[PDB]
Nucleic acid binder design. Structure first.
Ligand code: MG
Ligand code: MG
Lengths: 217, 218
DNA sequence: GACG
DNA sequence: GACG
């Protein structure tokens, strides 16, 4: 299809609200894993996988343009006030230099992985990038939704939210459901359930991020 | 003295070995924090929570020489396994990245590292000297958490990272195998008495471009 | 020492 | 659904 994805980038965004509200990103986290590190499961239940030794990790809190919805502030512990008080910058030109440089240290093709990404994280990110005079640093990178991926894996009435899956696989509640990094780590663990099968699935379904259309605007 | 450092960037490096060995960085973690983000109830005193708003960067870096057996034992990293997963080298992009990471910080910026005055800071300087790019740390500052933690404790035996932690908190550090683990350990330590901590560190911050390279300038 |  |  687009060849074997050499790097998986688990991605999660915290933001000001749900899609209907035209949300802005308050926190982003990327965790780049090499396929090799990934294809590097137990019995029942299997232990929670340890993450690979070799990973690159990025986590940035971000001052949004508009205030957080009350619901989003309670879930994330983030507000427009504090991100600005504490001097967080906008989703600006730099941030894309930063992402660019971070993406630059991953062997291509890179494929972004997000949970409900096709509905939420991907179109959100696209929107936020579109706002920039800078060129997007993701044009060359691919993406895929982990919900689709795990529906297929688990096939070998269920909820497919992040926590429903995680608890189901490992019979443990996820560690941190309130930060971008927490959600990425939970995401990573469900994707390590069947590393072999999943990377195969990711390779078949990888899709260009350039196409992903904006949530809004 | 230099003014107020806006960002405390806790820093830790893993590497091929110790200073005598001419060591190369293999992993790097920065956790950037704002002076704002800085009580406790119970015994032994709880391991505090990292603050909510933080920027975190953690990168694996391929070194041009093999990891000494002791560095591999500590970190579980090896040159060949970094290279499998096509980790890059400490190059110009990296500096751009760090540049950009630091440029998202409120200035001025002060690195804090455990033994940095003797290991991380001079080593970082060496890594940055090797390449085409200007250093991103040319305008950055530095302080050692050992010296800092000395004072603060002497106003209330070993000062290895773990010894301080286990002693304040009565738990083993969560992870001593990775750069982020050490940054987080270092972070919790610096939250024992953050008020003073930061009192202590705005009095002491110093240039990083005064930092002499551990070695080399090949 | 204390850092890998 | 499921994302904040
Ligand atoms: Mg999410
Ligand atoms: Mg250290």
């Amino acid at each position: 299809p687009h060849g074997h994805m050499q790097t998986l980038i688990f991605l999660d965004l915290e933001a000001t609200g749900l899609p209907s509200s035209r949300p802005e990103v308050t926190e982003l986290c990327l965790l780049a894993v090499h396929r090799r590190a990934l294809e590097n499961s137990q019995g029942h239940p299997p232990p929670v996988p340890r993450p690979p030794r070799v990973v690159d990790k990025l986590s940035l809190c971000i001052a949004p343009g508009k205030a957080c919805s009350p619901g989003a502030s309670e879930i994330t512990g983030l507000s427009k006030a504090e991100l600005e008080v504490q001097g967080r910058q906008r989703f600006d030109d730099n941030l894309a230099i930063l992402l660019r440089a971070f993406l630059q240290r991953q062997p291509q093709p890179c494929c972004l992985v997000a949970h409900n990404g096709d509905r939420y994280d991907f179109p959100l990110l696209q929107t936020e990038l579109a706002r920039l005079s800078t060129p997007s640093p993701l044009d060359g990178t691919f993406c895929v939704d982990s919900i689709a991926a795990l529906k297929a894996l688990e096939q070998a009435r269920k909820s497919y939210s992040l926590g429903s899956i995680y608890t189901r696989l490992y019979w443990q509640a996820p560690t941190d459901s309130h930060t971008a990094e927490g959600n990425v780590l939970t995401l990573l663990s469900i994707c390590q359930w069947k590393p072999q099968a999943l990377l195969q699935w990711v390779d078949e379904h990888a899709r260009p991020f350039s196409t992903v259309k904006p949530m809004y605007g």
